[PDB]
Write an enzyme that holds these catalytic residues in place. Structure first.
Site, PDB file in Angstrom:
ATOM      1  N   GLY A  42      52.758  -2.086  31.898  1.00 24.61           N
ATOM      2  CA  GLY A  42      52.512  -0.702  32.257  1.00 24.61           C
ATOM      3  C   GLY A  42      53.469  -0.256  33.350  1.00 24.61           C
TER       4      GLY A  42
ATOM      5  N   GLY B 182      53.855   3.351  36.358  1.00 25.92           N
ATOM      6  CA  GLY B 182      53.370   4.618  36.885  1.00 25.92           C
ATOM      7  C   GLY B 182      54.165   4.981  38.132  1.00 25.92           C
ATOM      8  N   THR B 183      53.813   6.097  38.798  1.00 25.22           N
ATOM      9  CA  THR B 183      54.475   6.412  40.058  1.00 25.22           C
ATOM     10  C   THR B 183      54.090   5.321  41.052  1.00 25.22           C
ATOM     11  OG1 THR B 183      52.774   7.929  40.756  1.00 25.22           O
ATOM     12  CG2 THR B 183      54.729   8.897  39.651  1.00 25.22           C
TER      13      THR B 183
ATOM     14  N   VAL C 297      55.550  -0.706  38.648  1.00 24.58           N
ATOM     15  CA  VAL C 297      55.469  -1.515  37.432  1.00 24.58           C
ATOM     16  C   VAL C 297      54.258  -2.460  37.473  1.00 24.58           C
ATOM     17  CG1 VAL C 297      57.221  -3.141  38.378  1.00 24.58           C
ATOM     18  CG2 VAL C 297      56.729  -3.195  35.974  1.00 24.58           C
ATOM     19  N   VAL C 298      53.591  -2.696  36.335  1.00 24.70           N
ATOM     20  CA  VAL C 298      52.575  -3.734  36.234  1.00 24.70           C
ATOM     21  C   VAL C 298      53.026  -4.841  35.276  1.00 24.70           C
ATOM     22  CG1 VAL C 298      50.114  -4.151  35.792  1.00 24.70           C
ATOM     23  CG2 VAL C 298      50.839  -1.975  36.745  1.00 24.70           C
TER      24      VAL C 298
ATOM     25  N   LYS D 192      50.257  -5.455  40.110  1.00 25.18           N
ATOM     26  CA  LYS D 192      50.776  -4.119  40.357  1.00 25.18           C
ATOM     27  C   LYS D 192      51.715  -4.242  41.554  1.00 25.18           C
ATOM     28  CE  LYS D 192      47.761  -0.507  39.863  1.00 25.18           C
ATOM     29  NZ  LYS D 192      47.051   0.767  40.023  1.00 25.18           N
TER      30      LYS D 192
ATOM     31  N   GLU E  62      42.563  -9.090  38.245  1.00 23.09           N
ATOM     32  CA  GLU E  62      42.010  -9.558  36.988  1.00 23.09           C
ATOM     33  C   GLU E  62      42.710  -8.873  35.815  1.00 23.09           C
ATOM     34  OE1 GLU E  62      37.691  -8.795  34.816  1.00 23.09           O
ATOM     35  OE2 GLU E  62      38.277  -7.646  36.592  1.00 23.09           O
TER      36      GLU E  62
ATOM     37  N   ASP F 136      39.390  10.247  38.133  1.00 21.11           N
ATOM     38  CA  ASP F 136      40.386  10.191  37.069  1.00 21.11           C
ATOM     39  C   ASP F 136      39.852   9.330  35.922  1.00 21.11           C
ATOM     40  OD1 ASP F 136      42.881  11.158  36.084  1.00 21.11           O
ATOM     41  OD2 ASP F 136      43.991   9.489  36.850  1.00 21.11           O
TER      42      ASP F 136
ATOM     43  N   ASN G 233      42.409   4.669  31.540  1.00 18.75           N
ATOM     44  CA  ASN G 233      42.030   4.042  32.801  1.00 18.75           C
ATOM     45  C   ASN G 233      40.743   3.219  32.636  1.00 18.75           C
ATOM     46  OD1 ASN G 233      44.200   5.121  34.293  1.00 18.75           O
ATOM     47  ND2 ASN G 233      42.975   6.820  35.122  1.00 18.75           N
TER      48      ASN G 233
HETATM   49  C1  LIG Z   1      43.842  -5.523  34.032  1.00 16.69           C
HETATM   50  O1  LIG Z   1      45.091  -5.730  33.385  1.00 16.69           O
HETATM   51  C2  LIG Z   1      45.571  -4.617  32.643  1.00 16.69           C
HETATM   52  C3  LIG Z   1      46.222  -3.562  33.513  1.00 16.69           C
HETATM   53  C4  LIG Z   1      45.969  -3.504  34.879  1.00 16.69           C
HETATM   54  C5  LIG Z   1      46.563  -2.512  35.642  1.00 16.69           C
HETATM   55 BR1  LIG Z   1      46.148  -2.413  37.494  1.00 16.69          BR
HETATM   56  C6  LIG Z   1      47.440  -1.607  35.060  1.00 16.69           C
HETATM   57  C7  LIG Z   1      47.643  -1.727  33.697  1.00 16.69           C
HETATM   58  N1  LIG Z   1      47.068  -2.684  32.938  1.00 16.69           N
END
Ligand SMILES: COCc1cc(Br)ccn1
Lengths: 262, 302
Positions: free
Chosen positions: B15, B17-18, B21-22, B37, B85, B131, B136
């Site tokens: 993933g 976002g602002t 990176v994840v 994250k 997790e 949100d 999410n």
């Molecule tokens: C829990 O693992 C999946 C996951 C966690 C996060 Br924070 C952002 C995107 N995806």
């Protein structure tokens, strides 16, 4: 209605009660600080009162910052030259947590009159975060006060403002107020304000909610009543100035009672 | 804290976002799969971001099976890694793969029931999420679903004071926010879950507007345009205009046709105009719609 979260206010109150104990500063940290004193802390807090005024910050922000500072100074020894740097980073972190529109870092550098650099402020922000392990959702006097206010029959703005004022006065003076939990100072503040303005006392219904009575509040109340009586004489005056403003109903101009009959 | 990046082996990006990176990663000593994250404090003109300060401080205290667990925070001078997790998927992606078959009614009910547990836990700990949307909500292989992304969350006081406006991704945003109301509360999280309930049934967003005013209009055309009777105060709200078209409330069996009587009942209470009458997460857990869920409460993590 929902703004008062009827379904969760008790759960929340109980949780705040648990957290205030975990977030509590060491009661006697000042005597273990070689180079700073209650008097210096008082000057810092008073100044943070002026900063919140200048930047039109929430009172909640002010309370959080003081919580951060007291916790920090409980495990980290600080030279008088650096106390303001701790306070500045504390106010920054509080603002980023609690404010919709926190002042930028550079404004924080500005209010310290270029004593410190931007780089120093951001490095103390990191240190404070390390020391507190990012535990910044701390219970404050205000979080309790606002709940206690829901027990007024009926609501009274003079009472609410005066209680806020008295709570703020307590931030200034580590002796004696480090030894009281936010929930207790709030109780004292509320009862004193209520008594002063309306003659009434700490209500039954808050005895149900809190388990506190005039008995259990008595020590704190005697201290807060002295602080109130002496407030015109205190070295630090920024809170009295602030609470002359109409925003707070000019409550600093009310006369304290001469006795509590408690 | 007691963590070190040397103990992790990255596996893939998952993933962005602002926020940053994840990566999915593996703890090389314990075996634990985690999501890292990364928050690049490197760019710190303003020091540590407020989103991260809120996310970390708030997640620290929220231990619950239906809220994603923050396991650790590695605070270097250059970067900030949040160790979470790991969960294999999000609800939006799953619904895109639930093709047309749809999500079976057992699984919708299970998911909604877990979501309410998670949210009830948040409100009970003085946290608004702000949100809630399918992207999410993370699901695992065991059938758990968990609130995630607390970057927009906020610690509230009782009663609430004025907080940030136009919070919540638009399709999931409550009428009271759209109307510029001075105060909002826990009821905004319920609205979002309401929207999400509907979406799990149809696999389509319930109110997909392309502006604030279009969002309102789509809501009004579905639930009828609110007046002083259904919602006292509405006509006094800062962004309420008398010129608003007055749509009649359509029968609720038309809003989500496949939904049973219990389902309709719960959904109507989640989508009540009046934030004061909208159901709480805590009360919704007792709703008859859930009578026949028997998926074991998933266990908390360490
Ligand atoms: C829990 O693992 C999946 C996951 C966690 C996060 Br924070 C952002 C995107 N995806």
């Amino acid at each position: 209605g929902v703004n008062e979260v009827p379904d969760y206010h008790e759960d929340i109150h109980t949780y705040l009660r648990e957290m205030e104990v975990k977030c509590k500063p060491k009661v006697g940290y000042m005597k273990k600080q070689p180079d700073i004193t209650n008097s210096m802390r008082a000057i810092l807090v008073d100044w943070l009162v002026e900063v919140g005024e200048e930047y039109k910050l929430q009172n909640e922000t002010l309370h959080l910052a003081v919580n951060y500072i007291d916790r920090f100074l409980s495990s980290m020894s600080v030279l008088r030259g650096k106390l303001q740097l701790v306070g500045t980073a504390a106010m920054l972190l509080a603002s980023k947590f609690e404010e919709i529109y926190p002042p930028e870092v550079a404004e924080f550098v500005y209010i310290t009159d270029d004593t410190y650099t931007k780089k120093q402020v951001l490095r103390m922000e990191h240190l404070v975060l390390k020391v507190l392990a990012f535990d910044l959702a701390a219970p404050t006097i205000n979080q309790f006060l606002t709940q206690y206010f829901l027990h007024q029959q009926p609501a009274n703005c003079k009472v609410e403002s005066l209680a806020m004022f008295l709570g703020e006065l307590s931030l200034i003076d580590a002796d004696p107020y480090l030894k009281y939990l936010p929930s207790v100072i709030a109780a004292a503040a509320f009862h004193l304000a209520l008594y002063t303005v309306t003659g009434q006392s700490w209500p039954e219904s808050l005895v149900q909610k809190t388990g506190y009575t005039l008995e259990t509040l008595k020590p704190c109340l005697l201290d807060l009543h002295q602080t109130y009586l002496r407030a015109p004489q205190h070295a630090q005056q920024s809170i009295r100035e602030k609470y002359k403003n109409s925003k707070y109903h000019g409550v600093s101009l009310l006369n304290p009672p001469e006795t509590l009959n408690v | 804290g007691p963590g070190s990046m040397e103990n992790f082996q990255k596996v893939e990006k998952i993933g962005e976002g602002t926020y940053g990176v994840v990566y999915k990663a593996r703890n090389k000593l314990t075996g634990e799969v985690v999501a890292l994250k990364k928050i690049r404090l490197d760019t710190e003109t303003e020091g540590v971001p407020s989103t991260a300060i809120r996310e970390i401080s708030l997640l620290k205290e929220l231990n619950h099976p239906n809220i994603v667990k923050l396991l650790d925070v590695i605070h270097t001078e250059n970067k900030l890694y949040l160790v979470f997790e790991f969960l294999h998927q999000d609800l939006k992606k799953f619904m895109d793969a639930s093709a047309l078959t749809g999500i079976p009614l057992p699984l919708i009910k299970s998911y909604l029931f877990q979501l309410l547990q998670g949210l009830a836990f948040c409100h009970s700990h003085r946290v608004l999420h702000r949100d809630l949307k399918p992207q999410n909500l993370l699901i695992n292989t065991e059938g758990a679903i968990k609130l995630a992304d607390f970057g927009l969350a906020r610690a509230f006081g009782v009663p609430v004071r004025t907080y940030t406006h136009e919070v919540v991704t638009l399709w999931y945003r409550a009428p009271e926010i759209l109307l510029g109301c001075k105060y909002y509360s826990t009821a905004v999280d319920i609205w979002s879950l309401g929207c999400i309930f509907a979406e799990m049934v149809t696999r389509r967003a319930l109110f997909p507007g392309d502006s604030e005013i279009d969002q309102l209009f789509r809501i009004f055309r579905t639930l009828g345009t609110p007046d002083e009777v259904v919602w006292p105060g509405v006509t006094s709200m800062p962004d309420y205009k008398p010129s608003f078209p007055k749509w009649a409330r359509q029968d609720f069996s038309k809003v989500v046709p496949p939904l049973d009587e219990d389902g309709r009942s719960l959904l109507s209470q989640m989508l009540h105009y009046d934030p004061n009458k909208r159901i709480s997460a805590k009360a919704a857990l007792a709703h008859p719609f859930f009578q026949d869920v028997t998926k074991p409460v998933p266990h908390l993590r360490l």
